[PDB]
Amino acid sequence: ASVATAYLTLKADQAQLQLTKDTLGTYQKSFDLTQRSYDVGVASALDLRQAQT
């Protein structure tokens, strides 16, 4: 029972890491768009910091 539930936790956390990498990709592309909007002049630096955090 213990080795079955240990393999099930590892199997779930592989997919947890796979989803967290995709969330990091979405946040990183949102920061890239806010950096482009800051570099031209539309967005202020406050939205740039709020996208960086």
Residues that bind another protein (CB under 8 A): 36-37, 40-42
| CB nearer to another protein: pick between 4 and 40 | 40
| CB nearer to another protein: pick between 13 and 39 | 39
Q: Please state the separation of Cα 13 from the chain's center in Å.
A: 16
Angstrom CA distances, 14 to 8, 22, 31, 49, stand at 10, 13, 26, 31
Q: How far is the CB of 11 from another protein (least distance, A)?
A: 43
Q: How far is the CB of 16 from another protein (least distance, A)?
A: 35
